[PDB]
């Protein structure tokens, strides 16, 4: 249950990375993300 617990801290700090990509608006930033 732990590694579970990791995984989802690996998830919500990969989903926090990909919303710092979409944090300049652009057409190769939302392609990259």
Do not use: Y
């Not at 249950?1 to 998830?11: F, P, V």
């Not at 944090?23 to 993300?33: A, E, G, T």
């Amino acid at each position: 249950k732990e590694l579970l617990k990791g995984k989802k801290q690996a998830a919500v700090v990969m989903l926090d990375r990909i919303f710092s990509v979409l944090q300049p608006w652009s057409d190769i930033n939302l392609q990259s993300f």
